[PDB]
Amino acid sequence: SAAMYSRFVKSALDDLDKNDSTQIGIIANQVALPSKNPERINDKNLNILLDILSSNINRIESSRGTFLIQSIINFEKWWELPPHTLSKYIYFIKILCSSIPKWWQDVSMILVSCFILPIKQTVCHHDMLKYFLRMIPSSMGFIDTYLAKFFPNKNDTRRKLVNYTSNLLKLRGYCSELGFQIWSLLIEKIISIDVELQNELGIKELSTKLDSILTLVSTHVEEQVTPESLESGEGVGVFNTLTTLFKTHVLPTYYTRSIQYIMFHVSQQQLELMDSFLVTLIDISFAVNEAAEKKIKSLQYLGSYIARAKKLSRTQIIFVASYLTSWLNRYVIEREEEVDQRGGMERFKHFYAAFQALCYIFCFRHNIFRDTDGNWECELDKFFQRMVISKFNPLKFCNENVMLMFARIAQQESVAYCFSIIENNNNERTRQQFIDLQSYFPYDPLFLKNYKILMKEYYIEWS
Template sequence: MMAFENTTKRSSQDVMNSVDSKKRKVEFAKDVTLYPISNNDGEENTVKSTEEINGFSSAIYARFVKSALDDLDKNDTTQINVIADQLSLGEKSSDKIKPENLNILLDTLSSNINRIDSSKGTVLIQSLISLNKWWQLPSFTLSKYIYFIRVLCSSIPKWWQDVSMNLISNFPSLSLDDAHYHHDLLHYFLRMIPSSMNFIDSYLVKFFPNKNDTRKSLVNYIGNILHLTKYCKELRFQVWSLIVEKIISIDVELQNELDEMDDDIESDFEDEEDEDDDEDEERKDKDASLMDEDDDGEEEEEEMEGVEEYNVEVTQNIKELANKLDAILTLVSNNISTEVTPESIENGDGVSIFNTLTTLFKTHILPTYYTRSIQYVMFHLSQQQLELMDSFLVTLIDISFAPNETAEKKIKSLQYLGSYIARAKKLSRTQIIFVASYLTSWLNRYAIEREEEVDQPGGMERFKHFYAAFQALCYIFCFRRNLFKDLDGNWECELDKFFQRMIISKFNPLKYCNENVMLMFARITQHEDIAYCFSIIENNNNERLRGIVGKADSGQKNGANNVAASTSVWSLATRQQFIDLQSYFPFDPLFLKTYKEMMKDYYIEWSEASGELESDHESDE
């Protein structure tokens, strides 16, 4: 048991001496017995009501608490239970315990903690632990309450489990400022009882608000548990895991909702997200108009109105999800900006946060298909320092070309690599050229080693890793072409010769890479006088129109020797999966209003890179 000094503690005699001297003085013997009060029928009434107890003077209340403890020593819990009931009363109850009486109770219990250490005292302890809004008590009483909790959990450590659970359960309803005393207690006891991290970890999971909970609850909770990692770094990975999982859940649901929307509704929604705040009322009117003339009651419009009402409901749900995601991601990245600084990177703490999120990127974010926003956490974090960008690029390159990774994961990583290089504003020219050099070297080796396989039986899906790498390089070139010329006007990595060679290779990448990217690539290479792709693209389109796949199937069945034609055969499922993967650009423009504004200094819009070639909206579709 640890000893604590309570400088505010007063004896019962001191309290008595403070009674107004003008009032009639009542002297008590040293041993006072509170006898039962008889009612009018002569029957003993051994239980005082909370109203009676609340009306006691401080001196009498102190005697009452002492009497309750004496009775508890004799296994009589009657008076203890009355106190416990009073503590459990609601905020608005007139019988709620007065602060001055609560002061006496806390002082007395802090000095007699072992006397309530029994099953008989449990109800009183639990009432104090769960005291309604204890953090709003008057400061003098609050200090006594916190002192009592410290004495209780230090003397009887088993109660820390209940106390910590109660503290964390309050996080959804409290802002970080309001939860100041919660964190003080958590900080104190996590240092004193390090083993308690095990059950606190489970409470963090248990009380994490559902994704359908309010935005305020989610933001409060995430803000509080992020603050917890400042004084308990041992729980950092668990906390970030929970946050990333929750964000992914909302992000995926939001993306699914958007995918299911009619194109015109989605367009209206994204347009609204880009409007200024002073147009809020106009947006509301626009939403209301979707209701059509619902109040007219015309029967012939009933079916159509039902559909429109559904669209309004879906749009509202999407807005709620988007607002939650926007607020959470803004909070998370603001936290990162505060925690990951040059100083914290120097002392290693910032690197620890980066490594934690890099691990979660590899295990949670990268394998999840078509998240739209969560990846911007790493996008933002990595750009806090040149060395962090180096590390993130190496991570993506390692995954993209790891022999033991699945083809789908390699392709996904290449999509991240290309999109990151294209969009990350803080990248240096050296970093960009390094990645381009790595990709051109790998593609050259691949072509030398495997181009002859194109003429052999088998579908072109065999080379999807090649196409993903080529597409990533083309995407980078479209955004960063101005950086690839040296001072003499020569192309770095000999990109002019490289592209000329690749587009006429048997792999025919202009046919199997994303159509929008290849069209933009064709326009830019023609503008830069590097290569002429449109004739090849036109020929590829004509082949599709002629049904080359059907002819190839027929040729194979008839035993024809047209092996080259057979290479164009793709199974429908495989081709669709590849097209889906190739059409994913992780760092396409954000539509979350606040978060997008926050990323402004880190993000390259297509309008900044394209010049007069094409608008960002048209390119990124």
């Protein structure tokens, strides 16, 4: 009957040139049933069909040829095949839609939507993709509405969603020179679980899914940024747009705390790539025509980027940030003749924060703040002494938690004297919500139990 089926599929293609075309549409209603039913198309009848249709294969594009292409590519759940039928069917994707941007456009609609599937079901879901990312230059046009399209929300069940978050690191690892598109969904969607998290600080579903992102993404991307690809591979191109992309989806949202852990882990592993991010924190707040609240948080990204870590060139921490200690000299020479003019005290958000952020280094690393000889680092007996009774009172408008850790170490280590001033504070002592930006510290202590696997590495306890 195999020779009886081969003439049943050869007598179809004739009479479309005789404008009858009888036996065409009968088969295409069979290739759309599920695999739940034995009366569909099977192994033997398809590869015989996919060669007899390929006799003179210029026979698709006519007025009747939309009903044929769809359900062949819509062979639903197409990973149920032995390795003999699997050959010519994958070849038929390589012949049907090799140049027409109309149904190959409906192929990457399938191959991206079938990346929600587990990785051992995607043995060829991305190897089909990687071949045309090195051969075809311009098939990037009609996939540019296919990345954020196939992001469902959490109304779908758990295992389809977060497995899709890992399936595109295979795909990006061979498509390296492009750089920026693949992130542009997964940069936005760190915030969406995080937005529903700090206002919850239905909540248990944020536990293991965040375990399914934090240990997942910050390990395989950590194996992307690697010392074996510093100056020979594509590693310099990684850093070029993971600063401005961090600047436009961590800085514009406030009180949203699970997102500053992207570059908090892969460049603390080394010496230079932290210091590549040490110049990143410099250029932000130090211009004129920038945003309004850019002076506070960006230099607050220097507070626990220095304190709670372990791998720092600490001979460079005083050296590179010497301009901020030279700011403290520049702030007292040129900029203390303006206070009795029109205005209050709150012109200087740069002053209660970056001075606080360097004093956020104070209570945590006191053995760094001493040398071998016996003096103080940069003469602490005058430098943090000159700023007491000036026209701002930097012991008046302060924080609660860290700015009242100023009471233990200042006396027993003989740092400062403010114990007769604390009673004198609360007599003299928009703007009502100005405290909302000056209360949160960026790199807080870690609360989770299974991402602490990665980040107890360069994180020390209180001493």
